[PDB]
């Protein structure tokens, strides 16, 4: 066994004033893998976990730039992070 490879194909599907919806694909095979979503304002650091390859980030600041990483995790440990994805919430 070994840590999983990174999540793949990360897309920011929708963005609103206070939410951002994320989509991705499971990592290349290395067992059960879950995910760690780290996001922050790009100008506190937030971290949430998910079992499915989608996440709706909530109660974000309007008209704000965000960075987001996603990591895969199994019972060995976490993958190397995704590349950083940039998105921007809609102004109020």
Numbering used by the authors: 291 to 320, 324 to 336, 341 to 389
Quote the study on this structure.
We found that FNIII2 alone but not FNIII1 or FNIII3 could promote cKIT tyrosine phosphorylation, suggesting the essential role of FNIII2 domain in mediating sDscam cis interactions.
Chelicerata sDscams could be classified into two subfamilies, sDscamα and sDscamβ, containing one and two variable Ig domains, respectively. Crystal structures and cell aggregation assays demonstrated that both α and β subfamilies of sDscam used Ig1 for the isoform-specific trans recognition in a hand-in-hand manner. Furthermore, the cis interactions were established by the three FNIII domains of sDscam, which assemble into a cross fold with a kink between FNIII2 and FNIII3.
